[PDB]
Design an enzyme around this catalytic site. Structure first.
Site: not given
Ligand SMILES: [As]
Ligand SMILES: [Zn+2]
Ligand SMILES: [Zn+2]
Ligand SMILES: [As]
Ligand SMILES: [As]
Ligand SMILES: [As]
Ligand SMILES: [Zn+2]
Ligand SMILES: [Zn+2]
Ligand SMILES: [Zn+2]
Ligand SMILES: [Zn+2]
Ligand SMILES: [Zn+2]
Ligand SMILES: [Zn+2]
Lengths: 333, 333, 333, 333
Positions: A63, A164, A194-195, A217, A305
């Site tokens: 993603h 990410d 995707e998030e 990922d 994150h």
């Molecule tokens: As993730």
């Molecule tokens: Zn991810």
């Molecule tokens: Zn993520």
């Protein structure tokens, strides 16, 4: 071990969920087009790069959206209020610098301020009134990302914003460059949103209708101080992580052991991954139409994150190598 | 500014999730049939009204189900126990009057009683025993709605049960009446079961396979006492709300700015909407098959999910006007 | 309004308490030497710049030390544990990038991690063992600062690390450049260790034995969302702040009103400051030997003690202007 | 490795803060006089021993006061109430024996009694009334110390009352005996009232006006069960501790690395010390007049501030050796 310049280009391009077209989309198209036969952008914005093949139809997804913030209100004194795009933790916004995107390729700086939750959070951009903030180009809906840059940590590690899943975008770009006359019809997909719900993976997989699906990922690497050994999940530098299951998917056991056997045969370092609560594009791909057998390879990453995610180049290289070998041998599966 | 009689017909017809056929379905068919070419009811109960067109296939959805209660048990002394259909808050059931639907077009009154949660809630219908309650027509599965009626509040506002999303049903009925020779193949859809998971929107969109999707619903107007300015979301009387994103969908940015530009050009009052935690039919429509670019217009509403929801006719009129203009100009998008 | 390049040089030079010699000391000497008659560095490291004068002996102090961290232990897996140098808040260290000073003018990056307190905080520098961390140049006692840079916020504001009290260092450098034939014997002092106890101000004042003392520092500007009006202290852009009192000193009332009158006469924007709990070099200077009448001018600053401190150039300019006027007229006091 | 008899003499002599003249003062004078040129006792009671020298004026301080208790009230039934002299923890007074000093060189026993705080603490001396207690020699202001004696623990360790800072007093007495024709003008100072505010160090340093200052004290050794490795501070038997910083002082970095280099060259075991919250005489010495560059060497000690403090003779010997080498080479610094 990694192409530093290329990695820098992918992690620093803006592209929050739903707004990938503001930067990352074009970087992906430009860096992959010469290695495939055709590149398309579908309705939700997914970039689909097709490398015509001699075998099973395989979809490989990474993603391209990153977490971020969106302006919800401009206070009378010029301060900005925000809402998260993706799973953002307020603790990672305090006393941080941000890039407030006022237009494509144009940003102004902002400072996050005031254990907090959303109702206490605000961004300061140096405005003295709502009118001045608007004159500066800010409005409801303005997107914001951390002001982070890629840097090296020691001999084999790196720190950056959006590893990410930009480290996975880097990975598929590297795989596309290495793949040569593979006995498979390959579709490299840089998915959107995707998030916020594996949304792009769902729609692109429906259109592609692959025989096999693979997602790349990042996975939690909690090999840090104070973490019980059984809760570390993965370790940096110990290899690419082959996913057994997470909250969104139980990888096909045949594919899981097949990847493990491939890693053993080609001497590629790897580790097995199990997550109690997470989510990946594979979670959408495998439930497409009548079902798609899928597997997932992950890059171990610490501090996921945040503006300071950390990965190890040895794991990135192992991921590129294992995915390449999988594509070259999938016709035998 | 609104057709009061028509609005009264749509908000007062019973139609809890899964049981829309008990009343609202027929009102919708009767009020829209003369303005379209064909009207169908699909397998889950969605009403699909097709106005044959000269351009892009567009789906416009407003859900016709409302929240309510279902009888789960009849106590020995005739009292009823219930379970919620949709997101019902116990605080809105205490010392309230209800319409207990014993048959299509036939109800008996009930009183909700005894900060409570579900295990303390019960409905009194005047029965002295379980047998008497059964003789009155009640059984496990009986559906119940509040006894609410449409009334005016001041110069431009109204109070009513089920403004969510009946005010949107009213809106599409008004749009269908105004739409003339639009360059688009339009499918007006009164969806079922939105309150329990956007279920009807999902199945109707799959069958229609639109090029563009638009949802019309209500959005939070928390412009009331004690609410911080940045948390009000929308204001009554300030215009139709163009959604940027909510928890179920990030509206296509191109459509969002296109709608905003249309509102500006035609002098239609509007406001931008961002919700941290909500859900709309657009959340299902846009993920249909290979993906559908979507947008959503909302009617600001106070006290959502109660027998006393409040809206402003000026916002309703702006919504009808903007959706009509969007349909007349979508062929240029 | 400010000399951006000079400001950048002073805020980005490393210089935590006790270790000012690692960078800031030399920047101060180089930038002030051509504007004074002699420059000395005393025993604790204070830089004393003397501009021989025709009147009262006046000491003007701005501290050059900044808050930071010191390595206390290197874990077996290479992670670093730290202790604060000055008043550091753990919430400002999470998910942040740092400059780990391994030698003068040489650093490596680090990432702060894991509402926390000191026992949960650690720094990741990419090492895999204590031995590798040591080979990278880290040891017990290694100092660390945030990786922050000076940037602009809107028309008149800036964000940076160490505005406290580097913005004051900038101020005295600017005053030294503007001061011409002042009727006073001036001693500009860049003090050390203010953040740990006003230590440098104490020893330099003892040696100088001034007739008058003035300190320049930053003061709280809490003119941000959620702060009651009476608790904002100062406002950005409203002028230099003339201190009436803080926890460490009650400024001489005659000097306070004298400065206020000077500001009025020369049309320099100013605001009066009262702090319930704070500390400044004036707190040490005024208690030197038999006592020294003192005053203090402050630059309003938001988010003090973080990597994202914010100031307004209009207040900085007012501070430079008022201090210059005070020095030119102090002979009449 | 240590002169046991001499150590016993210094730890068992009474000398609580402010009352050092009751015992420890005379022990220090008697044991050091034959190794210096002159011994004086200043106004607050500090013992200043001067060894005339050929170089820099150096002050070496070890405080001779110990923590203790003072009688605040005598109850009607003869029990005593107390107030702490220094940082005493109530948990260390329960079910303990004490020496109640009724006159110089004369004491009676007492028992501490009744997690407690001061209002629950009392001392029982066997009296039946206030009058009997007074007849026994007790009055408001009577000082009290624990009844502790020096004993050996295993091969290299010892347990005793007042190792803080009597082990440092022992150390300077040993250094004075070893020092021969040092190129320095040395002032050995047994300071008073360190436990209540570094008071004696402040006044003696003012009078001496040294070029360099060194303090010798104990530092926390928390290398005990249940303590996280990064929080142990120092380890017994691992060497003399060279202080980098504590809450009262940041040792001069040049002196810190100079001592470390001296230890390396002469093969003296050492460890680096950083304390988050503590205090030492150096904290007063370095701020004397125009400032004094200082360093501090500490003896690691477990269970500080109790009747059972524990030290390791190998660390004591290393401290004596390093301080001796520092004095013999300081002329080159
Ligand atoms: As993730
Ligand atoms: Zn991810
Ligand atoms: Zn993520
Ligand atoms: As809703
Ligand atoms: As300060
Ligand atoms: As101590
Ligand atoms: Zn709704
Ligand atoms: Zn609803
Ligand atoms: Zn300051
Ligand atoms: Zn400060
Ligand atoms: Zn001590
Ligand atoms: Zn002590």
């Amino acid at each position: 071990m990694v192409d530093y310049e290329l990695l820098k280009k992918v992690v620093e391009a803006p592209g929050v969920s739903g707004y990938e077209f503001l930067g990352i989309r074009d970087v992906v198209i430009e860096e992959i087009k010469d290695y495939v036969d055709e590149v398309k952008v579908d309705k939700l914005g997914n970039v689909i790069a097709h490398k015509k093949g001699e075998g099973p139809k395989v979809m490989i997804a990474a993603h391209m959206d990153q977490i971020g913030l969106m302006v919800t209100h401009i206070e009378k004194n010029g301060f900005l209020r925000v809402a998260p795009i993706g799973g953002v933790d307020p603790k990672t916004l305090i006393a941080q610098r941000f890039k407030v995107w006022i237009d494509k390729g144009k940003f102004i700086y902002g400072v996050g301020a005031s254990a907090p939750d959303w109702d206490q959070i605000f961004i300061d951009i140096g405005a003295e009134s709502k009118e001045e903030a608007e004159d500066m180009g800010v409005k409801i809906g303005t997107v914001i990302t951390w002001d982070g840059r890629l840097e090296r940590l020691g001999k084999h590690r790196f720190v950056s914003i959006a590893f990410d899943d930009r480290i996975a975008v880097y990975t598929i770009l590297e795989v596309a460059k290495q793949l040569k006359d593979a006995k498979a019809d390959v579709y490299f997909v840089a998915t959107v949103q995707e998030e916020v719900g594996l949304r792009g993976a769902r729609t692109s997989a429906f259109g592609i209708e692959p025989d096999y699906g693979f997602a790349i990922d990042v996975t939690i690497a909690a090999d840090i101080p104070g973490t019980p050994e059984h809760k570390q999940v993965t370790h940096l530098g110990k290899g690419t992580a082959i996913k057994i299951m997470d909250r969104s998917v139980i990888c096909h056991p045949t594919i899981v052991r097949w990847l493990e056997e491939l890693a053993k045969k080609h001497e590629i370092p790897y580790q097995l991954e199990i997550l109690l609560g997470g989510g990946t594009d594979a979670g959408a791909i495998h439930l497409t139409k009548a079902g798609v057998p899928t597997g997932a390879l992950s890059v171990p990453a610490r501090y996921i994150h945040s503006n300071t995610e950390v990965v190890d180049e040895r794991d990135v290289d192992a991921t590129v190598e294992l995915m390449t070998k999988a594509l070259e041998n999938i016709h035998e599966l």
